[PDB]
């Protein structure tokens, strides 16, 4: 109907709030800041995911970096 998706992603930087007018996937935001997953879990909402999924108006993306990881 009216694509517009507003989503948070929480980090170290806590929660951020971001809204994109048309609606992604996880690969797409994640590579435009390109965020190396190599290094960092990213989560949908508490359960563990790949940047294969989509995002969603109301989607929590919890992405949280491995202290020690590297």
Same mark, same amino acid.
């Given at each position: 109907? &009216?694509? #517009?998706?507003? =989503?948070? &992603?929480?980090?170290?930087? #806590?929660? *951020?709030?971001? @809204?994109?007018?048309?609606?992604?996937? !996880? *690969?797409?935001?994640?590579?435009?800041? $390109?965020?190396?997953?190599?290094? +960092?879990? +990213?989560?949908?909402?508490?359960? !563990? &995911?790949?940047? $294969? @999924? @989509?995002? =969603?108006? #109301?989607?929590?993306? @919890? +992405?949280?970096? &491995?202290?020690?990881?590297?």
């Amino acid at each position: 109907m &009216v694509i #517009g998706m507003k =989503f948070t &992603v929480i980090t170290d930087d #806590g929660k *951020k709030i971001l @809204e994109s007018g048309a609606p992604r996937r !996880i *690969k797409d935001v994640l590579g435009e800041l $390109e965020i190396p997953i190599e290094t +960092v879990v +990213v989560k949908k909402n508490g359960q !563990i &995911v790949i940047d $294969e @999924e @989509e995002i =969603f108006d #109301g989607d929590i993306i @919890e +992405v949280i970096r &491995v202290i020690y990881g590297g």
